[model samples]
Target: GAMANPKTIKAAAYNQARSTLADAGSRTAAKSHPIHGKTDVPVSYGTSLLAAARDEFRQADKKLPAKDKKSDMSIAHYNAVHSAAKTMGIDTW
Candidate 1:
């Protein structure tokens, strides 16, 4: 059973973002096809924000420590979409 409320949820999102940042950093360092592929497109503004956040975080993670607050802030940026979704009754949880 996961904890409830926005605080716990937000923390969980940050944790996931740490994993995401590392994965994206590894791919970027490798110059992987998926990262370079041009066909990957954001279907909407939400995804566009996500892509941008990932890009920023990956670049930061290339040199920043794993526990740096930058990755946490990146998650905050991405989670803004969830805040909007919640307002629209999207039930992000």
Candidate 2:
């Protein structure tokens, strides 16, 4: 059976939650190392952005209907986004 439309809502919520957490952690790290200034901040921000993107991609994968997995477009999009994240050194879980 297809995932109910409600799963989309849940996935969005999950992505938001992950982003918020990452932002908070990044901010805390920045504040603790104010001497480093924005230099490290961009890396932190990039990491957080990548993390959020990955989470969103994962959610999309989970919410996709079974039949959608066989679609080349769907697989390509997911792999592209995921590979981009990895390329940015955001491979951490």
Candidate 3:
């Protein structure tokens, strides 16, 4: 019980990550209002740009940038967009 095994550490970290994801999801769903207009259209980034990012992200061959570009977007941007898009139930196609 006192041993600090790497396997145990990874297992505990994984469990914590799962719980955090679930709790964060609940918090966002309850508080966030990603909508607009009279009929309730969810606010979002540009259509074409987001579409491109999503498709790029979906591509298994594409490698995520390890760092930010000089004046361009990266997988980090796509990830942020993807999270919001999924929350808003946007089409990922």
Candidate 4:
């Protein structure tokens, strides 16, 4: 069998990646939720940053920093707001 050929490399690597992703996802499932309150504190930087980014926005109280200053999430938040504002003819920075 010519299974060692590069032609099969894509399939092999794709299968490997899919299997790895599924394994990690299942581990994140089944055992969850330590939140017993309306407000819960995140444990680490990664967790806190992710939670913040989920609801991050760009406005007066939440303006974005310089383009090179903050996260892609900041830029992403800006564009969504920018585009919507532009369409609505609402003048903003």
Cα lDDT tens digits for candidate 4, 12-68:
222232233233232222233222322322223223222222233323225445564
lDDT of each: 0.37, 0.40, 0.34, 0.30
- TM-score of every candidate relative to the true structure: 0.25, 0.34, 0.27, 0.25
Against the correct fold, how does model 2 do in TM-score? 0.34
lDDT of 1 by residue, 1-93 (tens): 223222222323332333454443433324322222233222232233334444555554455455653544444434543443332222323
Instruction: Give model 4's clash tally.
Output: 0
- The predicted structure with the larger TM-score, 1 or 3, is 3
Sorted on lDDT, best first, the list reads: 2, 1, 3, 4
Per-residue lDDT value at 90 in model 2: 44
Model 1 clash pairs are: none
Please list the residue runs of candidate 2 whose C-alpha ends up more than 4 Å from where it truly belongs after superposition.
Answer: 1-42, 65-74
Ten consecutive residues with minimal summed lDDT in candidate 3? 2-11
Backbone clashes per model, in order?
A: 0, 0, 0, 0
Instruction: Quote the positional error of residue 91 for candidate 4 in Å.
Output: 1.1
Point to the candidate with the largest TM-score. 2
